[PDB]
């Protein structure tokens, strides 16, 4: 009946946001771990996916390559850092392990990578339900 759960809530709204509006900072390509899931877990899946975002922001935060373009991106990507964080928090629940090395299969345009977190999530809220 419901939720099914809180973290996939927050999760959604946070992975809805990052995508929707997209900036010159979510085609800095991190791996594609999807396609290394190949004979893995949701979970394991979901803990270099951990990792692998975690890093990802933590480090670009002060790379103002992207976010000093004006002062529109600047903000741009303060905004979406902050998303992508909020993401790792509430992921790791999901996840169900602690974190894990990363065992790269491609490379994903952040964008991208997001929109099929976003949609996985999305199907798991209503198909579990509701």
């Known amino acids: ?18 995508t929707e509006q997209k900036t010159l900072c979510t085609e800095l390509t991190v791996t594609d771990i999807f396609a290394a899931s190949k004979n893995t877990t949701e979970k394991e899946t979901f803990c270099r996916a951990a990792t692998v975002l975690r890093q990802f922001y933590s480090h670009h935060e002060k790379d103002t390559r992207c976010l000093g373009a004006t002062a529109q991106q600047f903000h741009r990507h303060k905004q979406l850092i902050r998303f992508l964080k909020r993401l790792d928090r509430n992921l790791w629940g999901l996840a169900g392990l602690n974190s894990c090395p990363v065992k790269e299969a491609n490379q994903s345009t952040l964008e991208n990578f997001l929109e099929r977190l976003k949609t996985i999530m999305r199907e798991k809220y209503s198909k579990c339900s509701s």
């Open 1 to 18: 009946m419901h939720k099914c759960d809180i973290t996939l809530q927050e999760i959604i709204k946070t992975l809805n946001s990052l």
